[PDB]
Design an enzyme around this catalytic site. Structure first.
Site, PDB file in Angstrom:
ATOM      1  N   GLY A  10       6.909   5.486   0.349  1.00  0.00           N
ATOM      2  CA  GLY A  10       7.168   6.251  -0.852  1.00  0.00           C
ATOM      3  C   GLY A  10       7.780   5.479  -2.011  1.00  0.00           C
ATOM      4  O   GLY A  10       7.169   5.412  -3.079  1.00  0.00           O
ATOM      5  N   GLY A  12       9.872   2.505  -4.440  1.00  0.00           N
ATOM      6  CA  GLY A  12      10.145   1.136  -4.908  1.00  0.00           C
ATOM      7  C   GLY A  12      10.407   1.141  -6.422  1.00  0.00           C
ATOM      8  O   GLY A  12      11.339   1.818  -6.876  1.00  0.00           O
ATOM      9  N   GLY A  14       7.872   3.680  -9.507  1.00  0.00           N
ATOM     10  CA  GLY A  14       8.290   3.182  -8.197  1.00  0.00           C
ATOM     11  C   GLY A  14       7.937   4.077  -7.015  1.00  0.00           C
ATOM     12  O   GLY A  14       8.054   3.658  -5.859  1.00  0.00           O
ATOM     13  N   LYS A  15       7.510   5.307  -7.300  1.00  0.00           N
ATOM     14  CA  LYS A  15       7.169   6.266  -6.251  1.00  0.00           C
ATOM     15  C   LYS A  15       5.680   6.230  -5.890  1.00  0.00           C
ATOM     16  O   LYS A  15       4.817   6.054  -6.759  1.00  0.00           O
ATOM     17  CB  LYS A  15       7.569   7.688  -6.659  1.00  0.00           C
ATOM     18  CG  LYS A  15       9.040   8.016  -6.421  1.00  0.00           C
ATOM     19  CD  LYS A  15       9.257   9.522  -6.353  1.00  0.00           C
ATOM     20  CE  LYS A  15      10.624   9.883  -5.804  1.00  0.00           C
ATOM     21  NZ  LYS A  15      10.657  11.291  -5.310  1.00  0.00           N
ATOM     22  N   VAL A  16       5.409   6.398  -4.595  1.00  0.00           N
ATOM     23  CA  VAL A  16       4.060   6.475  -4.042  1.00  0.00           C
ATOM     24  C   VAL A  16       3.923   7.811  -3.321  1.00  0.00           C
ATOM     25  O   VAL A  16       4.708   8.115  -2.419  1.00  0.00           O
ATOM     26  CB  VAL A  16       3.813   5.351  -3.023  1.00  0.00           C
ATOM     27  CG1 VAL A  16       2.408   5.454  -2.446  1.00  0.00           C
ATOM     28  CG2 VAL A  16       4.043   3.985  -3.661  1.00  0.00           C
ATOM     29  N   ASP A 114       5.447  -9.609  -4.387  1.00  0.00           N
ATOM     30  CA  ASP A 114       6.369  -8.805  -3.596  1.00  0.00           C
ATOM     31  C   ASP A 114       5.769  -8.411  -2.261  1.00  0.00           C
ATOM     32  O   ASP A 114       5.778  -7.242  -1.903  1.00  0.00           O
ATOM     33  CB  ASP A 114       6.856  -7.565  -4.383  1.00  0.00           C
ATOM     34  CG  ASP A 114       8.144  -6.927  -3.767  1.00  0.00           C
ATOM     35  OD1 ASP A 114       8.831  -7.620  -2.988  1.00  0.00           O
ATOM     36  OD2 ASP A 114       8.468  -5.743  -4.058  1.00  0.00           O
TER      37      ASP A 114
HETATM   38  O1  LIG Z   1      -1.311   4.137   1.991  1.00  0.00           O
HETATM   39  C1  LIG Z   1      -0.308   3.592   1.592  1.00  0.00           C
HETATM   40  C2  LIG Z   1      -0.243   2.939   0.272  1.00  0.00           C
HETATM   41  C3  LIG Z   1       0.746   2.192  -0.371  1.00  0.00           C
HETATM   42  C4  LIG Z   1       0.247   1.813  -1.612  1.00  0.00           C
HETATM   43  C5  LIG Z   1      -1.046   2.336  -1.713  1.00  0.00           C
HETATM   44  N1  LIG Z   1      -1.327   3.009  -0.569  1.00  0.00           N
HETATM   45  C6  LIG Z   1       0.864   3.593   2.469  1.00  0.00           C
HETATM   46  N2  LIG Z   1       0.798   4.132   3.724  1.00  0.00           N
HETATM   47  C7  LIG Z   1       2.035   4.004   4.286  1.00  0.00           C
HETATM   48  C8  LIG Z   1       2.519   4.361   5.532  1.00  0.00           C
HETATM   49  C9  LIG Z   1       3.839   4.089   5.829  1.00  0.00           C
HETATM   50  C10 LIG Z   1       4.656   3.475   4.899  1.00  0.00           C
HETATM   51  C11 LIG Z   1       4.167   3.104   3.658  1.00  0.00           C
HETATM   52  C12 LIG Z   1       2.845   3.377   3.352  1.00  0.00           C
HETATM   53  N3  LIG Z   1       2.109   3.114   2.183  1.00  0.00           N
END
Ligand SMILES: O=C(c1ccc[nH]1)c1nc2ccccc2[nH]1
Length: 256
Positions: A10, A12, A14-16, A114
């Site tokens: 999620g 950094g 910064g959000k995913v 990074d």
């Molecule tokens: O699918 C991911 C992603 C990051 C950036 C673009 N896609 C993704 N899946 C994850 C599963 C666990 C922890 C971080 C994660 N990050």
């Protein structure tokens, strides 16, 4: 909307966000909120659909990037892997893929900058996919970035060395808490470099460290074969100019 949020995967950068892609079969995607240039570069890399980088599915427009979602990252994989850890051949496979992804990036003049287990993604079928590059914890930072002297592609091979080690150790090699601590903890293992491998005109001189000598790396990476040690050391070279490239790394005997 066209996408529908569900979680944070999620933070950094910064959000995913994990999101439902309503239009394309309700599949999970990862949504992310000089710009149109970085975006342009990201679309150009997508055209090659390299199998060791996350797919970019869409750009919406302030700015929402839609990527491929994968269920885990390297952190969670190293967490759940049963004792006595990652099989030797799995480590070898995952390294190759990592370096393949990286060489693809480096060859298209993109520097990740990074790399860490948290944005190395591990597919259920065991495919390695790099994420979180091309937009804009020190345990993975190269010396030359800590010292603020240079930021070329080698920066990412230093991070690869650190990850390689951690695949064996299942814990970080260099868990520093500051640039200066991190630099200290690094030289404690690799030793103080030649005076002419120490960057010119940076704030921190060689003499700010008395980290006597290089200790043999297998003391820290138990499990590691002779060849892995050679590769790992060529990655963890102090001088970015003397560090192995992703491209040369792909030919290292460790991968015979
Ligand atoms: O699918 C991911 C992603 C990051 C950036 C673009 N896609 C993704 N899946 C994850 C599963 C666990 C922890 C971080 C994660 N990050």
């Amino acid at each position: 909307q066209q996408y529908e949020c569900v979680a944070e995967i999620g933070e950094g950068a910064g959000k995913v966000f994990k999101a439902r892609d309503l239009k394309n079969g309700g599949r999970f995607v990862a949504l992310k909120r000089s710009t149109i240039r970085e975006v342009a570069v990201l679309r150009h890399l997508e055209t090659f659909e390299h199998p060791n980088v996350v797919r970019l599915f869409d750009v919406c427009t302030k700015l929402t990037l839609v990527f491929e979602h994968v269920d885990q990252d390297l952190t969670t994989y190293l967490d759940k892997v049963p004792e006595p850890g990652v099989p030797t051949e799995t480590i070898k496979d995952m390294m190759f893929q990592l370096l393949r992804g990286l060489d693809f990036l480096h060859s298209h003049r993109v520097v990740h900058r990074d790399l860490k287990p948290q944005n190395i993604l591990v597919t259920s079928s065991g495919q390695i996919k790099l994420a979180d590059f091309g937009l804009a914890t020190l345990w993975y930072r190269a010396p030359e970035v800590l010292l603020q002297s240079s930021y070329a592609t080698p920066v990412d091979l230093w991070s690869v060395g650190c990850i390689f080690a951690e695949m064996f150790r299942r814990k970080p090699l260099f868990r520093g808490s500051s640039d200066v601590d991190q630099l200290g903890k690094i030289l404690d293992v690799i030793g103080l470099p030649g005076e002419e491998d120490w960057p010119r005109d940076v704030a921190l001189p060689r003499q700010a460290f008395h980290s006597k000598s290089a200790q043999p790396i297998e003391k820290f990476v138990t499990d590691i074969d002779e060849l892995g040690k050679d590769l790992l050391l060529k990655c963890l070279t102090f001088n970015p100019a003397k560090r192995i490239s992703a491209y040369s790394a792909l030919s290292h005997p460790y991968f015979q």
